[PDB]
Amino acid sequence: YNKIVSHLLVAEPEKIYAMPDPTVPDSDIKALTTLCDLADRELVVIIGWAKHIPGFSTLSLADQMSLLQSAWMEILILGVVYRSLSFEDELVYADDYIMDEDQSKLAGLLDLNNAILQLVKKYKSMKLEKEEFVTLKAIALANSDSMHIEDVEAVQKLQDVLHEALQDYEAGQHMEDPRRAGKMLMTLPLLRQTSTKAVQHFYNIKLEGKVPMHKLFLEMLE
Ligand SMILES: CC(C)N1CCN(c2ccc(/C(=C(/CCCO)c3ccccc3)c3ccc(O)cc3)cc2)CC1
């Protein structure tokens, strides 16, 4: 077991809770408030998590911003997916917040979440392990295709470090399947697809607020 995967496991943020309001009756407005409140608390720990990724904090501050601005929804969704593996037709946003099909219909999220459930179903059949989760998550941040990177070279380096770490691990604990790392990489499109659609929905129903995401990430990064 190599040191990248080992440190990435160590850098996992702790459990966040959504704390839905037991007073408020379940409605479509409730769901968004809960998910909004939970996402904001996750975003704070997601930026701490990034800084422990080897080489991330050596990037320029604009490149740190560009990676997080490109990948934040992918990172949120991957977490939901991983927590959902041992459940059935349900998305585990938090240990205290689980959304089944009817609550997704009510939240206006049915199509999004059915796609997120394809991703869950797919990691189930490959028996996805925590070490692959945290490595795929790190790859998703680094492979996020930002429009404006200052140092293309350093960013490709971080890609290739995390890429090699994934290949390394799979060569290690998965000899039964010499193509498992390639299969892992091939689930990255579905994750970009649902995140692309989720971010678009984020903006359709105007959840961005007043402060643009790039200054929020600048504040959190300092
Ligand atoms: C005002 C500004 C500071 N922001 C920052 C971020 N913020 C936000 C970010 C992400 C969502 C996500 C849902 C669920 C996606 C589908 O399952 C979502 C709901 C509606 C539209 C798009 C996404 C979501 C995903 C994973 C997860 O662990 C938790 C939350 C919701 C809100 C609102 C507040």
Coordinates of N, CA and C and ligand atoms in Angstrom, one line a residue:
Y1 N 0.8 -1.2 0.0 CA 0.0 0.0 0.0 C 0.9 1.2 0.0
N2 N 0.7 2.1 -1.0 CA 1.6 3.3 -1.2 C 1.1 4.4 -0.3
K3 N 2.0 5.4 -0.2 CA 1.8 6.5 0.7 C 0.7 7.5 0.3
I4 N 0.5 7.7 -1.0 CA -0.6 8.6 -1.5 C -1.9 8.1 -1.0
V5 N -2.3 6.8 -1.3 CA -3.6 6.3 -0.9 C -3.7 6.4 0.6
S6 N -2.6 6.1 1.3 CA -2.6 6.1 2.8 C -2.9 7.5 3.4
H7 N -2.2 8.5 2.8 CA -2.4 9.8 3.3 C -3.8 10.3 2.9
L8 N -4.3 10.0 1.7 CA -5.6 10.4 1.3 C -6.7 9.8 2.2
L9 N -6.5 8.5 2.6 CA -7.4 8.0 3.6 C -7.4 8.8 4.9
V10 N -6.1 9.2 5.3 CA -6.0 10.0 6.6 C -6.7 11.3 6.5
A11 N -6.6 12.0 5.3 CA -7.1 13.3 5.1 C -8.7 13.3 4.9
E12 N -9.3 12.2 5.0 CA -10.8 12.2 4.9 C -11.4 13.1 5.9
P13 N -12.3 14.0 5.5 CA -13.0 14.8 6.5 C -13.9 13.9 7.3
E14 N -14.3 14.5 8.5 CA -15.2 13.7 9.4 C -16.6 13.8 8.9
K15 N -17.5 13.1 9.6 CA -18.9 13.1 9.2 C -19.5 14.5 9.4
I16 N -20.3 14.9 8.4 CA -21.1 16.1 8.5 C -22.6 15.7 8.7
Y17 N -23.3 16.5 9.4 CA -24.8 16.2 9.6 C -25.6 17.3 9.0
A18 N -26.7 16.9 8.4 CA -27.6 17.8 7.7 C -28.5 18.5 8.7
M19 N -28.9 17.8 9.8 CA -29.8 18.3 10.8 C -31.1 18.9 10.2
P20 N -31.9 18.1 9.6 CA -33.2 18.6 9.1 C -34.1 19.1 10.2
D21 N -34.8 20.2 10.0 CA -35.7 20.7 11.0 C -36.9 19.9 11.3
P22 N -36.9 19.2 12.4 CA -38.1 18.3 12.7 C -39.4 19.1 12.8
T23 N -39.3 20.4 13.2 CA -40.5 21.3 13.2 C -41.1 21.4 11.8
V24 N -40.3 21.7 10.8 CA -40.9 22.0 9.5 C -41.4 20.8 8.8
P25 N -42.7 20.8 8.3 CA -43.2 19.7 7.6 C -42.4 19.5 6.2
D26 N -42.2 18.2 5.9 CA -41.5 17.8 4.7 C -42.2 18.5 3.5
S27 N -41.4 19.3 2.8 CA -41.9 20.0 1.6 C -40.7 20.2 0.6
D28 N -41.0 20.7 -0.6 CA -39.9 20.9 -1.5 C -39.0 22.0 -1.0
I29 N -39.5 23.0 -0.4 CA -38.7 24.1 0.1 C -37.8 23.6 1.3
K30 N -38.2 22.6 2.1 CA -37.4 22.0 3.1 C -36.2 21.4 2.6
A31 N -36.4 20.5 1.6 CA -35.3 19.7 1.0 C -34.1 20.6 0.6
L32 N -34.4 21.7 -0.2 CA -33.4 22.6 -0.7 C -32.7 23.3 0.5
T33 N -33.4 23.7 1.5 CA -32.8 24.4 2.6 C -31.8 23.4 3.3
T34 N -32.2 22.2 3.5 CA -31.4 21.2 4.2 C -30.1 21.0 3.4
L35 N -30.3 20.6 2.1 CA -29.2 20.4 1.2 C -28.3 21.6 1.1
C36 N -28.9 22.8 1.0 CA -28.1 24.1 1.0 C -27.3 24.2 2.3
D37 N -27.9 24.0 3.4 CA -27.2 24.2 4.7 C -26.1 23.2 4.8
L38 N -26.3 21.9 4.4 CA -25.3 20.9 4.5 C -24.2 21.1 3.5
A39 N -24.5 21.4 2.3 CA -23.4 21.7 1.3 C -22.5 22.7 1.8
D40 N -23.0 23.8 2.3 CA -22.1 24.9 2.8 C -21.1 24.4 3.9
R41 N -21.6 23.6 4.8 CA -20.8 23.1 5.8 C -19.8 22.1 5.2
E42 N -20.2 21.3 4.2 CA -19.2 20.4 3.6 C -18.2 21.2 2.8
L43 N -18.5 22.3 2.1 CA -17.6 23.0 1.3 C -16.4 23.5 2.2
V44 N -16.7 23.9 3.5 CA -15.6 24.3 4.3 C -14.6 23.2 4.5
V45 N -15.1 21.9 4.8 CA -14.1 20.8 5.1 C -13.6 20.3 3.8
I46 N -14.2 20.5 2.6 CA -13.7 20.1 1.4 C -12.4 20.9 1.0
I47 N -12.4 22.2 1.4 CA -11.2 23.0 1.1 C -10.1 22.7 2.1
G48 N -10.4 22.3 3.3 CA -9.3 21.8 4.2 C -8.7 20.5 3.6
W49 N -9.6 19.6 3.1 CA -9.2 18.3 2.5 C -8.3 18.6 1.3
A50 N -8.6 19.6 0.5 CA -7.8 19.8 -0.7 C -6.3 20.1 -0.3
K51 N -6.2 20.9 0.8 CA -4.8 21.4 1.1 C -3.9 20.3 1.5
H52 N -4.5 19.2 2.0 CA -3.7 18.0 2.3 C -3.4 17.1 1.1
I53 N -3.9 17.4 0.0 CA -3.6 16.7 -1.2 C -2.2 17.1 -1.7
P54 N -1.3 16.1 -1.8 CA 0.2 16.4 -2.0 C 0.4 17.2 -3.3
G55 N 0.8 18.5 -3.1 CA 1.2 19.3 -4.2 C 0.1 20.4 -4.5
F56 N -1.1 20.2 -3.9 CA -2.2 21.2 -4.2 C -1.8 22.6 -3.6
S57 N -1.3 22.7 -2.4 CA -1.1 24.0 -1.8 C 0.2 24.6 -2.4
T58 N 1.0 23.9 -3.2 CA 2.1 24.5 -3.9 C 1.6 25.2 -5.2
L59 N 0.4 24.9 -5.7 CA -0.1 25.7 -6.8 C -0.3 27.1 -6.5
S60 N -0.5 28.0 -7.5 CA -0.8 29.3 -7.3 C -2.2 29.4 -6.7
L61 N -2.5 30.6 -6.1 CA -3.8 30.7 -5.5 C -4.9 30.8 -6.5
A62 N -4.6 31.2 -7.7 CA -5.6 31.2 -8.8 C -5.8 29.8 -9.3
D63 N -4.8 29.0 -9.3 CA -5.0 27.6 -9.7 C -5.7 26.8 -8.7
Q64 N -5.4 27.0 -7.4 CA -6.3 26.4 -6.3 C -7.7 26.8 -6.5
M65 N -8.0 28.1 -6.8 CA -9.4 28.5 -7.0 C -10.0 27.8 -8.2
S66 N -9.2 27.7 -9.3 CA -9.8 27.2 -10.5 C -10.1 25.7 -10.4
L67 N -9.3 24.9 -9.8 CA -9.6 23.5 -9.5 C -10.8 23.3 -8.7
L68 N -10.9 24.0 -7.6 CA -12.1 23.9 -6.7 C -13.3 24.4 -7.4
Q69 N -13.2 25.5 -8.1 CA -14.4 26.1 -8.8 C -14.9 25.1 -9.9
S70 N -14.0 24.3 -10.5 CA -14.4 23.3 -11.5 C -14.9 22.0 -10.9
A71 N -14.4 21.6 -9.7 CA -14.7 20.3 -9.2 C -15.6 20.2 -8.0
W72 N -16.0 21.3 -7.4 CA -16.7 21.2 -6.1 C -17.9 20.4 -6.1
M73 N -18.8 20.5 -7.2 CA -20.0 19.7 -7.2 C -19.7 18.2 -7.4
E74 N -18.6 17.9 -8.2 CA -18.2 16.5 -8.4 C -17.8 15.9 -7.1
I75 N -17.1 16.7 -6.2 CA -16.6 16.2 -5.0 C -17.8 15.9 -4.0
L76 N -18.8 16.8 -4.0 CA -20.0 16.6 -3.2 C -20.7 15.4 -3.6
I77 N -20.9 15.2 -4.9 CA -21.7 14.1 -5.4 C -21.0 12.7 -5.2
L78 N -19.7 12.7 -5.4 CA -18.9 11.5 -5.1 C -19.1 11.0 -3.7
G79 N -19.1 12.0 -2.7 CA -19.3 11.6 -1.3 C -20.7 11.0 -1.1
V80 N -21.7 11.6 -1.7 CA -23.1 11.1 -1.6 C -23.1 9.6 -2.1
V81 N -22.4 9.4 -3.3 CA -22.4 8.1 -3.9 C -21.8 7.1 -3.0
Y82 N -20.6 7.4 -2.4 CA -19.9 6.4 -1.6 C -20.7 6.1 -0.4
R83 N -21.4 7.1 0.3 CA -22.2 6.8 1.4 C -23.4 6.0 1.1
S84 N -23.8 5.8 -0.2 CA -25.0 5.2 -0.6 C -24.9 3.8 -1.0
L85 N -23.6 3.3 -1.1 CA -23.4 1.9 -1.6 C -24.1 0.8 -0.9
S86 N -24.3 0.9 0.5 CA -24.9 -0.2 1.2 C -26.4 0.1 1.5
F87 N -27.0 0.9 0.6 CA -28.5 1.2 0.7 C -29.1 0.8 -0.7
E88 N -30.4 1.0 -0.8 CA -31.2 0.4 -1.9 C -32.1 1.5 -2.4
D89 N -31.7 2.1 -3.6 CA -32.6 3.1 -4.3 C -32.8 4.3 -3.4
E90 N -31.7 4.7 -2.7 CA -31.7 5.8 -1.8 C -30.3 6.5 -1.9
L91 N -30.3 7.8 -1.7 CA -29.1 8.6 -1.6 C -28.8 9.1 -0.2
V92 N -27.6 8.8 0.3 CA -27.3 9.0 1.7 C -26.5 10.4 1.7
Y93 N -27.3 11.5 1.8 CA -26.6 12.8 1.9 C -25.8 13.0 3.2
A94 N -26.3 12.4 4.3 CA -25.7 12.4 5.6 C -26.3 11.2 6.4
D95 N -25.7 10.9 7.5 CA -26.2 9.8 8.4 C -27.6 10.2 8.9
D96 N -28.0 11.5 8.9 CA -29.3 11.9 9.4 C -30.2 12.4 8.2
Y97 N -29.8 12.1 7.0 CA -30.6 12.6 5.8 C -30.5 11.7 4.6
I98 N -31.6 10.9 4.4 CA -31.6 9.9 3.3 C -32.8 10.2 2.5
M99 N -32.6 10.3 1.2 CA -33.7 10.6 0.2 C -34.0 9.5 -0.7
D100 N -35.2 9.0 -0.6 CA -35.6 7.9 -1.5 C -36.3 8.5 -2.8
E101 N -36.9 7.7 -3.6 CA -37.4 8.2 -4.9 C -38.5 9.2 -4.7
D102 N -39.4 9.0 -3.7 CA -40.5 10.0 -3.6 C -40.1 11.3 -3.0
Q103 N -39.1 11.3 -2.1 CA -38.6 12.6 -1.6 C -37.8 13.3 -2.7
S104 N -37.2 12.5 -3.6 CA -36.5 13.1 -4.7 C -37.5 13.8 -5.7
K105 N -38.6 13.1 -6.0 CA -39.6 13.7 -6.8 C -40.1 15.0 -6.1
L106 N -40.3 15.0 -4.8 CA -40.8 16.1 -4.1 C -39.8 17.3 -4.2
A107 N -38.5 16.9 -4.1 CA -37.5 18.0 -4.1 C -37.2 18.5 -5.5
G108 N -37.8 18.0 -6.5 CA -37.5 18.4 -7.9 C -36.2 17.8 -8.4
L109 N -35.7 16.7 -7.8 CA -34.4 16.2 -8.1 C -34.4 14.8 -8.7
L110 N -35.6 14.3 -9.2 CA -35.7 12.9 -9.5 C -34.7 12.5 -10.6
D111 N -34.6 13.4 -11.7 CA -33.7 13.0 -12.8 C -32.3 13.0 -12.4
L112 N -31.8 14.1 -11.7 CA -30.5 14.1 -11.2 C -30.1 12.9 -10.4
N113 N -31.0 12.6 -9.4 CA -30.7 11.5 -8.4 C -30.8 10.2 -9.1
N114 N -31.6 10.0 -10.1 CA -31.6 8.7 -10.8 C -30.3 8.5 -11.5
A115 N -29.7 9.6 -12.0 CA -28.4 9.4 -12.6 C -27.3 9.2 -11.6
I116 N -27.4 9.9 -10.4 CA -26.5 9.6 -9.3 C -26.7 8.1 -8.8
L117 N -27.9 7.6 -8.9 CA -28.1 6.2 -8.6 C -27.6 5.2 -9.6
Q118 N -27.5 5.6 -10.9 CA -26.7 4.8 -11.9 C -25.3 4.6 -11.4
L119 N -24.7 5.7 -11.0 CA -23.3 5.7 -10.5 C -23.2 4.8 -9.3
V120 N -24.1 4.9 -8.4 CA -24.1 4.0 -7.2 C -24.1 2.6 -7.6
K121 N -25.2 2.2 -8.4 CA -25.3 0.9 -8.9 C -24.1 0.4 -9.6
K122 N -23.4 1.3 -10.3 CA -22.2 0.9 -11.0 C -21.0 0.6 -10.1
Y123 N -20.8 1.4 -9.0 CA -19.7 1.1 -8.1 C -20.0 -0.1 -7.2
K124 N -21.3 -0.4 -7.0 CA -21.7 -1.6 -6.3 C -21.1 -2.8 -7.0
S125 N -21.5 -3.0 -8.3 CA -21.1 -4.1 -9.1 C -19.5 -4.3 -9.2
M126 N -18.8 -3.2 -9.1 CA -17.3 -3.3 -9.0 C -16.8 -3.4 -7.6
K127 N -17.7 -3.5 -6.6 CA -17.3 -3.6 -5.2 C -16.2 -2.5 -4.8
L128 N -16.6 -1.3 -4.9 CA -15.7 -0.1 -4.7 C -15.3 0.0 -3.3
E129 N -14.0 0.2 -3.1 CA -13.3 0.2 -1.8 C -13.0 1.7 -1.4
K130 N -13.0 1.9 -0.1 CA -12.7 3.3 0.3 C -11.4 3.9 -0.3
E131 N -10.4 3.0 -0.4 CA -9.1 3.5 -0.9 C -9.2 4.0 -2.4
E132 N -10.1 3.4 -3.1 CA -10.4 3.8 -4.5 C -11.2 5.1 -4.6
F133 N -12.2 5.2 -3.6 CA -13.0 6.4 -3.5 C -12.2 7.6 -3.3
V134 N -11.3 7.6 -2.2 CA -10.5 8.8 -1.9 C -9.5 9.1 -3.0
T135 N -9.1 8.1 -3.8 CA -8.2 8.3 -4.9 C -8.9 8.9 -6.1
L136 N -10.1 8.3 -6.4 CA -10.9 8.8 -7.5 C -11.3 10.3 -7.2
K137 N -11.7 10.6 -5.9 CA -12.0 11.9 -5.5 C -10.9 12.9 -5.8
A138 N -9.7 12.5 -5.3 CA -8.5 13.4 -5.6 C -8.3 13.5 -7.1
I139 N -8.4 12.5 -7.9 CA -8.3 12.6 -9.3 C -9.4 13.5 -9.9
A140 N -10.6 13.5 -9.4 CA -11.7 14.4 -9.9 C -11.3 15.8 -9.7
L141 N -10.7 16.2 -8.6 CA -10.3 17.6 -8.4 C -9.2 18.0 -9.4
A142 N -8.2 17.1 -9.6 CA -7.1 17.4 -10.4 C -7.4 17.3 -11.9
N143 N -8.3 16.4 -12.3 CA -8.7 16.2 -13.7 C -9.9 17.1 -14.0
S144 N -10.1 18.2 -13.4 CA -11.4 18.9 -13.5 C -11.5 19.9 -14.7
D145 N -10.5 20.0 -15.6 CA -10.5 20.7 -16.9 C -10.9 22.2 -16.7
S146 N -10.3 22.9 -15.8 CA -10.6 24.3 -15.7 C -10.2 25.1 -16.9
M147 N -11.1 26.1 -17.3 CA -10.8 26.9 -18.4 C -9.5 27.7 -18.3
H148 N -9.0 28.1 -17.1 CA -7.9 29.0 -17.0 C -7.0 28.6 -15.9
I149 N -6.0 27.8 -16.3 CA -5.0 27.3 -15.4 C -3.7 28.1 -15.7
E150 N -3.1 28.6 -14.6 CA -1.9 29.4 -14.8 C -0.7 28.5 -15.2
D151 N -0.6 27.4 -14.4 CA 0.6 26.5 -14.6 C 0.1 25.1 -15.0
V152 N -0.2 25.0 -16.3 CA -0.6 23.7 -16.9 C 0.4 22.6 -16.5
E153 N 1.7 22.9 -16.5 CA 2.7 21.8 -16.2 C 2.5 21.3 -14.8
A154 N 2.5 22.1 -13.8 CA 2.3 21.7 -12.4 C 1.0 20.9 -12.2
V155 N 0.0 21.3 -12.9 CA -1.3 20.7 -12.7 C -1.3 19.3 -13.3
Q156 N -0.7 19.1 -14.5 CA -0.5 17.8 -15.1 C 0.3 16.9 -14.2
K157 N 1.3 17.5 -13.5 CA 2.1 16.7 -12.6 C 1.3 16.1 -11.5
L158 N 0.4 17.0 -10.9 CA -0.5 16.5 -9.8 C -1.5 15.4 -10.3
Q159 N -2.0 15.6 -11.5 CA -2.8 14.6 -12.2 C -2.0 13.3 -12.2
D160 N -0.8 13.3 -12.7 CA 0.0 12.1 -13.0 C 0.4 11.4 -11.7
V161 N 0.7 12.2 -10.6 CA 1.0 11.6 -9.3 C -0.3 10.8 -8.8
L162 N -1.4 11.5 -8.9 CA -2.6 10.8 -8.4 C -3.0 9.6 -9.3
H163 N -2.8 9.8 -10.7 CA -3.1 8.7 -11.6 C -2.2 7.5 -11.3
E164 N -0.9 7.8 -11.1 CA 0.0 6.7 -10.8 C -0.3 6.0 -9.5
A165 N -0.7 6.8 -8.5 CA -1.1 6.2 -7.2 C -2.3 5.2 -7.4
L166 N -3.2 5.6 -8.3 CA -4.4 4.7 -8.5 C -3.9 3.4 -9.2
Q167 N -3.1 3.6 -10.3 CA -2.6 2.4 -11.0 C -1.8 1.5 -10.0
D168 N -0.9 2.1 -9.3 CA -0.1 1.4 -8.2 C -1.0 0.6 -7.3
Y169 N -1.9 1.2 -6.7 CA -2.8 0.5 -5.7 C -3.5 -0.7 -6.4
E170 N -4.0 -0.5 -7.6 CA -4.7 -1.6 -8.3 C -3.8 -2.7 -8.7
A171 N -2.7 -2.4 -9.2 CA -1.6 -3.4 -9.4 C -1.3 -4.2 -8.1
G172 N -1.5 -3.5 -7.0 CA -1.3 -4.1 -5.6 C -2.3 -5.0 -5.1
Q173 N -3.5 -4.5 -4.8 CA -4.5 -5.3 -4.1 C -5.5 -5.9 -5.1
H174 N -5.3 -5.7 -6.4 CA -6.3 -6.2 -7.4 C -5.6 -6.8 -8.6
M175 N -5.0 -8.0 -8.4 CA -4.4 -8.8 -9.4 C -5.4 -9.6 -10.2
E176 N -6.5 -10.0 -9.5 CA -7.6 -10.7 -10.2 C -8.1 -10.0 -11.4
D177 N -7.8 -8.7 -11.6 CA -8.3 -7.9 -12.7 C -7.3 -6.8 -13.2
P178 N -6.5 -7.2 -14.2 CA -5.5 -6.2 -14.6 C -6.0 -4.9 -15.2
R179 N -7.3 -4.8 -15.3 CA -7.9 -3.6 -16.0 C -8.8 -2.8 -15.0
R180 N -8.7 -3.0 -13.7 CA -9.6 -2.4 -12.8 C -9.4 -0.9 -12.7
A181 N -8.1 -0.4 -12.8 CA -7.9 1.0 -12.7 C -8.5 1.7 -14.0
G182 N -8.4 1.0 -15.1 CA -9.1 1.6 -16.3 C -10.6 1.6 -16.2
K183 N -11.2 0.6 -15.6 CA -12.6 0.6 -15.3 C -12.9 1.7 -14.3
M184 N -12.1 1.9 -13.3 CA -12.3 3.0 -12.4 C -12.3 4.4 -13.1
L185 N -11.3 4.6 -13.9 CA -11.2 5.8 -14.7 C -12.5 6.0 -15.6
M186 N -13.0 4.9 -16.1 CA -14.1 5.0 -17.0 C -15.5 5.3 -16.3
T187 N -15.5 5.3 -15.0 CA -16.7 5.8 -14.3 C -16.6 7.4 -14.1
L188 N -15.5 8.0 -14.5 CA -15.4 9.4 -14.3 C -16.3 10.2 -15.2
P189 N -16.6 9.7 -16.4 CA -17.6 10.5 -17.3 C -18.9 10.6 -16.6
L190 N -19.5 9.5 -16.1 CA -20.8 9.6 -15.5 C -20.8 10.6 -14.3
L191 N -19.7 10.7 -13.6 CA -19.6 11.7 -12.5 C -19.6 13.1 -13.0
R192 N -18.9 13.4 -14.1 CA -18.9 14.7 -14.7 C -20.2 15.0 -15.3
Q193 N -20.9 14.0 -15.8 CA -22.2 14.3 -16.4 C -23.3 14.8 -15.4
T194 N -23.4 14.0 -14.3 CA -24.4 14.4 -13.3 C -24.0 15.7 -12.6
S195 N -22.7 16.0 -12.5 CA -22.2 17.2 -11.9 C -22.5 18.4 -12.8
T196 N -22.2 18.3 -14.1 CA -22.6 19.3 -15.1 C -24.1 19.6 -15.0
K197 N -24.9 18.5 -15.0 CA -26.3 18.8 -14.9 C -26.7 19.4 -13.5
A198 N -26.0 19.0 -12.4 CA -26.4 19.5 -11.1 C -26.0 21.0 -11.0
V199 N -24.9 21.4 -11.5 CA -24.4 22.8 -11.4 C -25.4 23.6 -12.3
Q200 N -25.8 23.1 -13.4 CA -26.7 23.9 -14.3 C -28.1 24.1 -13.5
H201 N -28.5 23.1 -12.8 CA -29.7 23.2 -12.0 C -29.5 24.1 -10.8
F202 N -28.3 24.1 -10.2 CA -27.9 25.0 -9.2 C -28.2 26.4 -9.6
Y203 N -27.9 26.7 -10.9 CA -28.0 28.1 -11.4 C -29.4 28.4 -12.0
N204 N -30.1 27.3 -12.6 CA -31.5 27.5 -13.0 C -32.4 28.0 -11.9
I205 N -32.3 27.4 -10.7 CA -33.2 27.7 -9.6 C -32.5 28.7 -8.6
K206 N -31.4 29.3 -9.1 CA -30.8 30.5 -8.4 C -30.4 30.2 -7.0
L207 N -29.5 29.2 -6.8 CA -29.0 28.9 -5.5 C -27.7 29.6 -5.1
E208 N -27.1 30.3 -6.1 CA -25.8 30.9 -5.9 C -25.7 32.0 -4.8
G209 N -26.8 32.7 -4.6 CA -26.7 33.8 -3.6 C -26.1 35.1 -4.2
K210 N -25.5 35.9 -3.3 CA -25.0 37.2 -3.7 C -23.5 37.2 -3.9
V211 N -22.8 36.5 -3.1 CA -21.3 36.4 -3.2 C -21.0 35.3 -4.3
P212 N -20.3 35.6 -5.3 CA -19.9 34.6 -6.3 C -19.0 33.5 -5.7
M213 N -19.1 32.3 -6.2 CA -18.4 31.2 -5.7 C -16.9 31.4 -5.7
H214 N -16.3 32.2 -6.6 CA -14.9 32.3 -6.7 C -14.4 33.2 -5.5
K215 N -15.1 34.2 -5.0 CA -14.6 34.8 -3.8 C -14.9 34.0 -2.5
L216 N -15.9 33.2 -2.5 CA -16.1 32.3 -1.4 C -14.9 31.4 -1.2
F217 N -14.5 30.8 -2.4 CA -13.3 29.9 -2.3 C -12.0 30.6 -2.0
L218 N -11.9 31.9 -2.4 CA -10.8 32.7 -2.0 C -10.8 33.0 -0.5
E219 N -11.9 33.3 0.1 CA -12.0 33.5 1.5 C -11.6 32.2 2.3
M220 N -12.3 31.1 1.9 CA -12.0 29.8 2.6 C -10.5 29.4 2.4
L221 N -10.0 29.7 1.3 CA -8.6 29.3 1.0 C -7.6 30.2 1.9
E222 N -8.1 31.3 2.5 CA -7.2 32.1 3.3 C -7.9 32.3 4.7
Ligands
LIG1 C1 -25.2 30.1 -1.4 C2 -23.9 29.3 -1.6 C3 -23.0 29.6 -0.5 N1 -24.1 28.0 -1.8 C4 -23.1 27.2 -1.8 C5 -23.4 25.7 -2.2 N2 -24.8 25.4 -2.2 C6 -25.3 24.0 -2.6 C7 -24.2 23.0 -3.1 C8 -24.6 21.8 -3.5 C9 -26.1 21.3 -3.4 C10 -26.4 19.9 -3.8 C11 -27.9 19.5 -4.1 C12 -28.2 18.0 -4.4 C13 -27.6 17.6 -5.7 C14 -28.5 16.5 -6.3 O1 -28.5 15.4 -5.4 C15 -28.5 20.5 -5.2 C16 -29.8 20.9 -5.0 C17 -30.4 21.9 -6.0 C18 -29.7 22.2 -7.1 C19 -28.3 21.7 -7.3 C20 -27.7 20.9 -6.4 C21 -25.7 18.9 -2.8 C22 -25.1 17.8 -3.3 C23 -24.3 16.9 -2.4 C24 -24.2 17.1 -1.1 O2 -23.5 16.2 -0.2 C25 -24.9 18.4 -0.5 C26 -25.6 19.2 -1.3 C27 -27.0 22.2 -2.9 C28 -26.6 23.7 -2.5 C29 -25.8 26.4 -1.9 C30 -25.2 27.5 -1.1

